[PDB]
Amino acid sequence: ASVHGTTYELLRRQGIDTVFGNPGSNELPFLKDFPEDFRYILALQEACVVGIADGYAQASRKPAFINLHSAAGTGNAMGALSNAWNSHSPLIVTAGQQTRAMIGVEALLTNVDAANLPRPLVKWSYEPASAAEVPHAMSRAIHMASMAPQGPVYLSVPYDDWDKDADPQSHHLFDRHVSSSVRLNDQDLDILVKALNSASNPAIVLGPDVDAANANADCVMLAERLKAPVWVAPSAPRCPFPTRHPCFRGLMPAGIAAISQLLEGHDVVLVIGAPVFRYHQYDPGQYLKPGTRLISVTCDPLEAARAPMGDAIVADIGAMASALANLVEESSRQLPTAAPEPAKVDQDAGRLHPETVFDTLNDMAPENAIYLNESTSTTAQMWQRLNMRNPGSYYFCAAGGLGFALPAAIGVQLAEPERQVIAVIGDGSANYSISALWTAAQYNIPTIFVIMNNGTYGALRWFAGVLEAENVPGLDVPGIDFRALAKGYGVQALKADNLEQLKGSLQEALSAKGPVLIEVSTVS
Amino acid sequence: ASVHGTTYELLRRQGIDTVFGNPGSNELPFLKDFPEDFRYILALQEACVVGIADGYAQASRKPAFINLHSAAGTGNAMGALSNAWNSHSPLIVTAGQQTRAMIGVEALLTNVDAANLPRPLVKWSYEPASAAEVPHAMSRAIHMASMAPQGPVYLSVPYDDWDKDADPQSHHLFDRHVSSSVRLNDQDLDILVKALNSASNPAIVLGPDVDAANANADCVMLAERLKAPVWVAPSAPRCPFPTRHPCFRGLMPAGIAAISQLLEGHDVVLVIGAPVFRYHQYDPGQYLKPGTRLISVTCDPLEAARAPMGDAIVADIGAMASALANLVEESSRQLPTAAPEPAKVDQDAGRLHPETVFDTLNDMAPENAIYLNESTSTTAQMWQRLNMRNPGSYYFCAAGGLGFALPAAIGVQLAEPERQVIAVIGDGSANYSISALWTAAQYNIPTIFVIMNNGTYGALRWFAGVLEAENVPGLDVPGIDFRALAKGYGVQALKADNLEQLKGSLQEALSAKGPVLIEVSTVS
Amino acid sequence: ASVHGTTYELLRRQGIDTVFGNPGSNELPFLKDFPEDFRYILALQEACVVGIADGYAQASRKPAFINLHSAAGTGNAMGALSNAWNSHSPLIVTAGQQTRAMIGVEALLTNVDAANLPRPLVKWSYEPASAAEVPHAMSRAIHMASMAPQGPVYLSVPYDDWDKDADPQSHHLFDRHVSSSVRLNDQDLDILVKALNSASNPAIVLGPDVDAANANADCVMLAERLKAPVWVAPSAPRCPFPTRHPCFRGLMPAGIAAISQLLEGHDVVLVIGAPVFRYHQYDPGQYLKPGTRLISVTCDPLEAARAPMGDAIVADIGAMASALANLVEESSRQLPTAAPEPAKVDQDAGRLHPETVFDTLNDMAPENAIYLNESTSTTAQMWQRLNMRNPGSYYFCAAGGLGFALPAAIGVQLAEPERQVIAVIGDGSANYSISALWTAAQYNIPTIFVIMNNGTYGALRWFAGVLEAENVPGLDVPGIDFRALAKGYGVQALKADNLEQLKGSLQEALSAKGPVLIEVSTVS
Numbered sequence A, B, C: 001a002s003v004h005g006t007t008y009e010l011l012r013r014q015g016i017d018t019v020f021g022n023p024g025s026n027e028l029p030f031l032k033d034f035p036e037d038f039r040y041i042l043a044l045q046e047a048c049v050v051g052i053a054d055g056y057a058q059a060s061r062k063p064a065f066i067n068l069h070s071a072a073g074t075g076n077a078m079g080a081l082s083n084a085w086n087s088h089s090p091l092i093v094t095a096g097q098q099t100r101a102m103i104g105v106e107a108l109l110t111n112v113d114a115a116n117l118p119r120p121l122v123k124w125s126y127e128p129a130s131a132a133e134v135p136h137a138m139s140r141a142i143h144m145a146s147m148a149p150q151g152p153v154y155l156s157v158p159y160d161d162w163d164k165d166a167d168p169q170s171h172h173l174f175d176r177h178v179s180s181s182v183r184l185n186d187q188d189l190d191i192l193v194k195a196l197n198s199a200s201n202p203a204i205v206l207g208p209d210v211d212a213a214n215a216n217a218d219c220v221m222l223a224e225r226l227k228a229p230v231w232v233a234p235s236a237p238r239c240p241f242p243t244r245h246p247c248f249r250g251l252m253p254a255g256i257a258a259i260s261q262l263l264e265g266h267d268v269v270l271v272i273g274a275p276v277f278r279y280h281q282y283d284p285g286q287y288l289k290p291g292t293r294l295i296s297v298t299c300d301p302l303e304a305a306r307a308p309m310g311d312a313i314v315a316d317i318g319a320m321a322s323a324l325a326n327l328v329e330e331s332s333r334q335l336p337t338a339a340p341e342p343a344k345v346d347q348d349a350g351r352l353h354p355e356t357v358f359d360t361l362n363d364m365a366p367e368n369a370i371y372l373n374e375s376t377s378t379t380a381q382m383w384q385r386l387n388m389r390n391p392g393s394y395y396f397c398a399a400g401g402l403g404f405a406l407p408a409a410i411g412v413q414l415a416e417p418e419r420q421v422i423a424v425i426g427d428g429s430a431n432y433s434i435s436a437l438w439t440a441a442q443y444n445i446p447t448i449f450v451i452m453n454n455g456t457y458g459a460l461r462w463f464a465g466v467l468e469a470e471n472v473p474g475l476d477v478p479g480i481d482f483r484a485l486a487k488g489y490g491v492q493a494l495k496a497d498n499l500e501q502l503k504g505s506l507q508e509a510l511s512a513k514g515p516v517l518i519e520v521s522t523v524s
């Protein structure tokens, strides 16, 4: 067998059947004789390739396989890798290298010092020392991406390796099963359970690894048993809990003082599947108020190590959430009361308040819709106004890096064909990965893109006001016609200049069989 | 509180009370006002510092704290870090940096790009961005070293940081408990147990992480229940099993073909706490013969990912070994028969055969002795001839890097004052870290050093013969007087030119109250 | 031709005929069939290997070739590389790697992520992607080490590559000549010369790259023409000027305020072949006083970039010094007056003051002696008391990293067999690379080692006093018998407890035909 044949068998045997890519010359020998049972999803720029793959992996809860061109292609994707690192996305990033005979002279297309290029944004990065090692290196990549804490990995392959003979002993790679589905030993788990049962006013904080693990339902049972309020950890990349469940308390503000105040009076705070904490704004104060003990369950040693407070347990979130949900006592305390309905913001017949947009989406979208957020000034309102009952219903750039949501919404839609995906994206954010739209058109992936157009980088204008910063350049982005951009990449385009048009446009988008972009005129 | 005071409180609160070090100017502000409840162990070169700390950590089964001088001191220790990485040794390596005001100009003693210096031999490497971050960075270092898979970490601290005010919120660091004591979820554990119970001819292979976890006794119960032979995984850094237990089958040869042949006929091979496998010699062939399934339990994702065959589970070795030992059925098969006694090699009244040395050590040493091996051509015979009943009884440079055993034997002896440590070290190996002897003298740490002196790099001569390599320079090391070197560093010195003198010397060494070096004239 | 044959031809053709090494298994296939016209110099630990090679390269003013064993051997040498980086030493560091077929599984002796190991202490670091690339990679290593600014490089080679067929086109590598012998263009050079000619009170500061370039005599002519005082830049690794020339003003103190004060009143300060500046102690103040302009000529962009003041020119020091010396006008100012003779410190019949030692060395040593300094508390006195008329007469660990001088003195002596080398080394420093003594004995390299024994890390005690630091552990090193250590490695040993014995011992050492160590009892 060739290295090419053995590697594709490995991938198939390990459950991979889709390649997200932008091709180049170093990759043609890998991509040739492309197996009939595999799918290739082309995107026009590598941030888009990786974004699409990322959404696909996150939604599918399985690794996604990527093929990029050498250093320039990998480099174009590195902002996308920043997000993937923070979301623990299992991405197998492969890139082609020059033929081994031309690496030394640094011929054009040579990826110099290749394994260092994507660092520090990958779990593992490697270029094999021989062609026969490639299948083994690919196996390592698959498992490194897939083991807890999941994350992106990188493999560079000289293009002449593919046609070489594989090692017959590579067959032992095909069916390897590697598990990290582990939980705290029984003795120490019993101690934890007793601490939760004995708490007088527990609280629960959930992060993205709960949704990644599909531990949402177990966390609901845990919160109902403990009669505890539930918050989503700050800067949330995913939604880990039904947002109209009586226990839900919403998104935590991303500040030290604000979180310790929220937790005041709670004697035990159990954090699951989140860093402690992904703060953002400067908000100095106490990490915890006196009287609060924090206990973190994380899939990631790096999270456990950097938490400035609390005990931690490093384990699989699915295994731990299931165990905890089934072991804790049913408290006789009263179940928390559901959050009140959000207020309706006054809306005239002119430009749309973002609150209006979210309320209308929540009114019209199916109950199993999936939302993506890259409307950076409106996140708090979005979290308050969308009823997200199901797992896998929300994604936000986990490193704050713009250019995620537009391609990721395509990948999510590919992963979940029966769930309408709706990406809510600011006019600023929409540009970073605008060319991703083409992939939705070409493959007829019926994502809905809602562009919130207020002509400015609104979150930056706001922060400049907080800083009392004057004379800041580059905050406005006037003069972008998003309907024309949609037409440019073959996506049906609609406008909404007022509420009546928003409703009409959303009705048309929801029934459409292809992707749709709606340009919404929002308040400045 | 100062950064100095807060950091030492953190260390004390986290169980650290000993600093292994070689001082320098960037470190004086850390070392001043040294707490009265801490111990400083000086060594004369940094390979020795780290070696001593490594032995201490491995034997104590807890982190060891190190302080080195900037780049040159760290660099002198990097061979020692190569071994520590492979043995999963929890070492907290700190190094002082220039004052922040002098870093830019690269004043003498500036550690340039400091965090990159020890890579790739550390789990985590960091220089804090401010003085008030130092306690938090130290906390990260402690936990990163201590979480599974354990390993060395590195922290560089500008010397002016120590006197600065600490953040009062650093108090939340002091009592953090971080656990990775996890095991496979119940459903999948039951599947594994059923596979072991249903095996017709199981075998067990154990590596160093069993001894590190003190899982030895649980593995004995597991092997007795399964009626299975037990091997030690190749290139063994530690001894995970009683070497005269009826199930013990010794050290596996470090070759692909040799191991698959040994495992032939065994339908299930359970590997615990080892890489799959730390091969050494070129010995191409099948990774496994038809009919053998391999299952690996490892504490290290990197091990699980690179295994070329078998299923893997990433979990704590102590937790998994205890669970497996208590869940498997008692097989009705006959218990394996103990290995026969080793042959007595003919010995005249002249230079000593290594077999003779090991037999005599085994005859005279206490049953709870601890051995270290850095006699590279005699390892197989050592493993056959020493009855090691207890955990923590054997150490060998885990990366094959010479210069470990002499300092590590001092650290092991410090960790286990009631257990006589005996380091068996070749004349070649003894030089790498010879100055470590001084620490044993100064602190009166009564390690016994047995120098196997045959005048040559014997393992290299042997391999040159295997390669049929002629005209290889640098293989002989004549003209070293080890008694004179011992006197140089204040260690009592004895000679053994024949068996009678070996017995006499060992009797004197075993009764001595200080360290002793015995120079043994072994066969060329 | 094999890769082995082609590589050794390349080395020979490029002027390399000596391998400094400590062997291992990954290196035997390189070292076998060792050419009859090459020399192998064995040392017992890799800090010693590299130190010896470094001294050889610095003194010979040509690259030195090193062969180390994989990661552990390379790691043991990294403190030595810290010094080599700072001294711009052209060192070609090669290390053997596992056979390509065993790299993936990380067999014992695999150097993982090899090219990252010695970073950031090398100019270039690389592992070739195929066997046929090895000669080309070796060529790159040779030239990268040798081009200005010179420095260490690293090459890792899988051991199976050596026996493979080489590319016949590798013959184009053999006779490549690569020059960096460049100087400032004529127009800008004329501007510089006019600035020097028009200065009313110029000063000159010289660093180690002057001695490396053998630009010493040109700098003498330059200083005589400009009638300018000459200082050696701080933390001096080499001596760039005759120390009894009337213009010489000695070693600059390594402090910001102290240097700007020394330069006050000098309208133009020309720095050649030094960083601006290798400060050490904290001595805040002005980089330059008003009225002083600084101009730096450096071979190193990194030096030019980080200088906090002055203009800079990046060029070859030899070419620039020769051009400047021959272009500047002869000033009619009076030649500076020679520094006065140093004072004779009172000396009783007891332990030796370091001043006494240096005065006696200067009285008895040949005029073409070469000195090395690793007596860290006595450097200022050494620089005042030794008349060093010739180039290549002084070496001091360029990064301050101890363990340089003892092995480097052996390498210097090998490079300069007609020049008596005298290494003056503190009792603390002597231990770091003590095993290097064996190489001097085995090869009969007649270096003289003068051990200044005061029982303590005196420079650290002094600095602790400056800091007013109490309770600093680890500052004393009692109980080392250096005569016994010398005997241990086969080096003739002498003692000097008083001045009469010092003179007697030095007379015997100077006439000896082998290496000699003198243990001198110096004042505490």
Ligand SMILES: Cc1ncc(C[n+]2csc(CCOP(=O)(O)OP(=O)(O)O)c2C)c(N)n1
Binding pocket: A079, A374, A375, A376, A377, A378, A400, A401, A402, A403, A425, A426, A427, A428, A429, A430, A432, A454, A456, A457, A458, A459, A460
């Ligand atoms: C790749 C990248 N570049 C720059 C930023 C900085 N960024 C933070 S929010 C913001 C404005 C985004 O504007 P828009 O999408 O229109 O949303 P709005 O803030 O107006 O709601 C920008 C540019 C970023 N996070 N990522």
Ligand SMILES: Cc1ncc(C[n+]2csc(CCOP(=O)(O)OP(=O)(O)O)c2C)c(N)n1
Binding pocket: B079, B374, B375, B376, B377, B378, B400, B401, B402, B403, B425, B426, B427, B428, B429, B430, B432, B454, B456, B457, B458, B459, B460, C022, C023, C024, C025, C069, C072, C073, C076
């Ligand atoms: C730091 C380091 N340098 C070099 C080697 C290569 N090495 C492998 S075994 C060997 C010989 C050791 O000789 P000795 O300790 O006398 O034992 P013997 O082989 O004679 O039993 C050497 C140098 C190594 N493993 N580590």
Ligand SMILES: Cc1ncc(C[n+]2csc(CCOP(=O)(O)OP(=O)(O)O)c2C)c(N)n1
Binding pocket: B022, B023, B024, B025, B069, B072, B073, B076, C079, C374, C375, C376, C377, C378, C400, C401, C402, C403, C425, C426, C427, C428, C429, C430, C432, C454, C456, C457, C458, C459, C460
């Ligand atoms: C590898 C290394 N480790 C530690 C130091 C810190 N160091 C600075 S000077 C000094 C003392 C050296 O003592 P000695 O050689 O006896 O000379 P003295 O200071 O007594 O003159 C030490 C350990 C260093 N520079 N390099």
Ligand SMILES: [Ca+2]
Binding pocket: A359, A362, A363
């Ligand atoms: Ca509504």
Ligand SMILES: [Ca+2]
Binding pocket: A060, A414, A415, A416, A417
């Ligand atoms: Ca799907």
Ligand SMILES: [Ca+2]
Binding pocket: A426, A427, A428, A452, A453, A454, A455, A456, A457, A458
């Ligand atoms: Ca906007």
Ligand SMILES: [Ca+2]
Binding pocket: B359, B362, B363
């Ligand atoms: Ca016996």
Ligand SMILES: [Ca+2]
Binding pocket: B060, B414, B415, B416, B417
């Ligand atoms: Ca103990």
Ligand SMILES: [Ca+2]
Binding pocket: B426, B427, B428, B452, B453, B454, B455, B456, B457, B458
């Ligand atoms: Ca030997």
Ligand SMILES: [Ca+2]
Binding pocket: C359, C362, C363
């Ligand atoms: Ca005199």
Ligand SMILES: [Ca+2]
Binding pocket: C060, C414, C415, C416, C417
């Ligand atoms: Ca010469």
Ligand SMILES: [Ca+2]
Binding pocket: C426, C427, C428, C452, C453, C454, C455, C456, C457, C458
């Ligand atoms: Ca001293």
Ligand SMILES: [Mg+2]
Binding pocket: A116, A117, A118, A119, A120
């Ligand atoms: Mg990078």
Ligand SMILES: [Mg+2]
Binding pocket: B116, B117, B118, B119, B120, C116, C117, C118, C119, C120
């Ligand atoms: Mg490094």
